RNA sequence: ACAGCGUCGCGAGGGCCGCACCCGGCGCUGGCGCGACGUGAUUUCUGCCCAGUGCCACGACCGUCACCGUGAAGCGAUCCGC
RNA sequence: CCACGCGCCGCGGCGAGCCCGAGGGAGCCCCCGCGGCGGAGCGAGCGCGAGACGCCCCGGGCCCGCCAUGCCCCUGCGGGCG
RNA sequence: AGGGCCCCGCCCGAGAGGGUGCAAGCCCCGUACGGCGAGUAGCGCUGCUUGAGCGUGCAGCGCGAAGGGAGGCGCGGCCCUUCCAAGGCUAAAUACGCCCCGGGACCGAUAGCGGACCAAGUAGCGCGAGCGAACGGUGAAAA
RNA sequence: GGCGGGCCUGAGGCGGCGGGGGCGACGGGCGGAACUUAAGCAUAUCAGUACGCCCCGGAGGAGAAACCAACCGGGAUUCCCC
């Protein structure tokens, strides 16, 4: 016994009977081989065409990761006006379309409009030898790379006009403002009742 | 393994040992008894794969 | 708190994009003269006419469901008692 | 514990009526509603279990062809060949069936239908009679004194036989031996012998058994008791032999 | 049909109460599973997906209106105290589903689409099911309904794959609160309660 | 167990049981009947007690004791009532 | 015995870092590979948020929160200093 | 009886293996190697369930809308952000026996399937539901 | 009074075309325990488990928001890592 942190495990359920809940991964090498052949057969079905498709660049959701970008379901119709294409045409050129997606920023439309332009520039469309020697895209098309951060070498005096002196007080004043004003209503209300 | 048998202990006063006994009176379902389920059976859950950095 | 506190939120521009179908009302009037009122409603219109509306906002919430939809039932029913 | 004897009696297994070799079961047609249908008592036979003698009588098939035989618990006084008449205009005699309203006050009745055209209900036991006593023309309801003596109101169009059922005095005979009961109960359902509940072990009966064989708490059991609880005298207004 | 959708919305209205009073009376004096010549409510039939094509059959199944009584014998459930209930249990599936399952058993050859509501009486509710003949050449040679003759869609109503099933399983609710029943009520528990024992571990 | 002896419910739109329900037994019955109970052939009888605990009331509604309904309130849950 | 949590102890690599994750690479022991965990606490929470010393150990002294208290104040039921 | 030793060699894109009378790349088969949206949503009251907590999902009965739902503490009032319930279809990546194929740092006849045996769900036993054994090896050739 | 003609509900019969039952798995819909654990035991727990029942298919179910979130946002389903 002694100082053991309490076990957080869950007592085993249906161990010898009912649902088979033990699923050992003994096929991990085997599954990887199976997926590779299937991916290779799909690539052969359209030799010029890429196996995967261009996906939109989207900001990762939630404050913790909201400064980097990840690949998403599809380009919005407003982002398709930038490349001047209808939804069906976009499917023909390999652009996946999320009609539900709403940009939520004008800035969002622009990073996406740039991504759409590159696909249209890079792609070559054929309706014999060229198709044989085309070379398809291997990998996610244009995988988005979040850049590493930098130092911008600005001027100290110019930046000092922006911040109030004793910055801590300014941040605290607006952090506690809802509470501080609320006390003022309670405080004034207490005074109103008597005198 | 060894569990594919119906054996229930005979009980004291019959003279024979109280271990699961098949209808015949033949020992069954015991780590020692002939044909019995191994005391703790070997199982695939053992981690055959160690990990190296 | 339900949002992170950033004294300035908005380094990026934001999007600015965010009815009755009147023909149906014509369908409703034709049905209303063919059908009449609902029996719960006829009690509410009487309650509005003879005994206040506090009771006729309580009897609505009970016979219907929520206050927002009950206060509505008061408005639609109010016209019949007051107009005559 | 276990379901007591009364509980098992509902199933109908081993406790059913032994109705084999019974003679059979003992309609206001237009001709009998307007007038009276003549009949002849072909024979009087002994039904199994039923103490009262039955009778087979045949009346013409009003429907169109044949003679339709009937079975009727018979009133005392029947003769094979009796001109039994049933109907509104049937005269007052033993054996005749006429609507209770027509029956004159006091005329004994048997086989009184509770409701008009019920084809037989009250007073069909051995030596049991009813008494027509009061006719109210308003609702056309004539009070009869049921054998028990409780008086009910019977609709005038309900009909009944005139007279008292035969077999009168059957009970006023001591059986003397257990065998004579065995052979009365063989004909009827399996209910005899009856073992007392003070005799049974606690598991079988609520009166149950104890180191001294008693009924324990009072025999009286409420009218609202569950099916296992109703084992003593039920809803007893008074107990004891009195005056 | 817009003037027939609104007319019905006022069911408590005397007009339709007179109709319902006669319709409940006729259905009562009639058999349990009756084949209906026409869908008693055409607009509702068309909304659910009924066209007047050969190979589409309408059948009405009466269900008892009631709360569940367990099958435990003599009225007693011999288990731990929590399980001792027999008279006040409430059905798991809506009467709508019950009507479909009863119709599906009566005609196993036919396939069940959706079901509408036709009338109700304090003793029994009457749900009118819409069924489709999967073998008529018209149905197989019709692009829109061809999906019924797929053999995966055999016995939609026994496996609770109808709308009533999608209401009982709670599939209709989406988002927080159904997260633990989407793959299936049983599968989601199974996926969560599994020891992966990944090999490289 | 039994013959006998009592007690007790019940007039069928009813008693008393079956019974997951659908509904079945007594009942092809009808108070000289169906059931529920005791006691245990005759001869002779069967005292007194209703406090308690049972049971019973076309014995009333005193008080207490539910859901609905309904009053008063509060914006509304809800709460006080009757 | 075997899996799986947890507490230690020894060892191996690497060190403010570290990690055969699932996967993907004509790829299977080879390459590539995120959360995670640590790097900071404390408070129920709004939140506030550590430096001053030393081979080590131990204690002392201070510093950060949580809890009262005084003072001063500026961008005030807010900030500073005790 | 060499498939043994002892001298010597030969083929290898084949030295995986099995057979053959003793331990066989070269004695045989092989192996490498080729080719041809209304009785609804809601609400009340009960039951059922969930980690969902003045309620996660469901249902019974009562009662039942029109702009209505959600935002994880209720209840009203005011906004915001986001979606259209009460109709359906739809590949992929996921699961898994019988069945067939390969590999096992697997057990080697009281082991390993109950069952390695010419006839194991068999001989038997039990009214029945059901239970369920034991039993492999002569040699190079039956000579 | 009767007697035809349609419409509408309902009958018999024929023709074609389907249904049924079989799988120790996987997948759906149900009805649903208890030993066990709480060192007793009622809620809890085993467990939305066995078992009973009805269903398909090579997969099945699920699935294109009356979705998440609160951001310099995502955006059908299923499965994996966390």
UniProtKB/TrEMBL annotation, chain B:
Sequence positions that bind Mg(2+): 19
Family indicated by similarity: Belongs to the universal ribosomal protein uL4 family.
Protein name (database record): Large ribosomal subunit protein uL4
From TrEMBL, chain C:
One GO CC annotation: cytosolic large ribosomal subunit
Gene3D superfamilies: 60S ribosomal protein L36
Top-level taxon in the UniProt lineage: Eukaryota
One protein family per Pfam: Ribosomal_L36e
Alphabetized UniProt keyword annotations: Ribonucleoprotein, Ribosomal protein
GO terms under biological process: cytoplasmic translation
GO molecular function, a single term: structural constituent of ribosome
InterPro entries, A to Z: Ribosomal_eL36, Ribosomal_eL36_sf
Statement: the UniProt record of this protein carries the keyword Cell membrane: no
Sequence similarity: Belongs to the eukaryotic ribosomal protein eL36 family.
The protein's name: Ribosomal protein L36e
Taxon lineage: Eukaryota, Metamonada, Diplomonadida, Hexamitidae, Giardiinae
From TrEMBL, chain D:
Domain Large ribosomal subunit protein uL2 C-terminal stretches: 92-227
Superkingdom of origin organism: Eukaryota
Keyword tRNA-binding assigned: no
Domain Large ribosomal subunit protein uL2 RNA-binding: 10-86
GO cellular component: cytosolic large ribosomal subunit
Keywords: Ribonucleoprotein, Ribosomal protein
GO MF annotation: an example: RNA binding
SUPFAM superfamilies given in the database record: Nucleic acid-binding proteins, Translation proteins SH3-like domain
Pfam families according to UniProt: Ribosomal_L2_C (PF03947), Ribosomal_L2_N (PF00181)
GO biological process annotation, one example: cytoplasmic translation
Family as reported in the entry's similarity comment: Belongs to the universal ribosomal protein uL2 family.
NCBIfam families assigned to the protein according to its UniProt record, in alphabetical order: PRK09612.1
Listed PANTHER family: LARGE RIBOSOMAL SUBUNIT PROTEIN UL2, RIBOSOMAL PROTEIN L2
This protein's name: Ribosomal protein L8
Species this chain originates from: Giardia intestinalis (strain ATCC 50803 / WB clone C6)
Automatic annotation (TrEMBL), chain E:
Keywords from the UniProt entry: Ribonucleoprotein, Ribosomal protein
A Pfam cross-reference name: Ribosomal_L15e
Protein name: Ribosomal protein L15
GO biological process, one term: cytoplasmic translation
One cellular component term from this protein's GO annotations in UniProt: cytosolic large ribosomal subunit
Organism classification: Eukaryota, Metamonada, Diplomonadida, Hexamitidae, Giardiinae
Coiled coil: none
Domain of life: Eukaryota
Gene Ontology MF, one: structural constituent of ribosome
Annotated family: Belongs to the eukaryotic ribosomal protein eL15 family.
Organism: Giardia intestinalis (strain ATCC 50803 / WB clone C6) (Giardia lamblia)
UniProt xrefs under PANTHER family: LARGE RIBOSOMAL SUBUNIT PROTEIN EL15, RIBOSOMAL PROTEIN L15
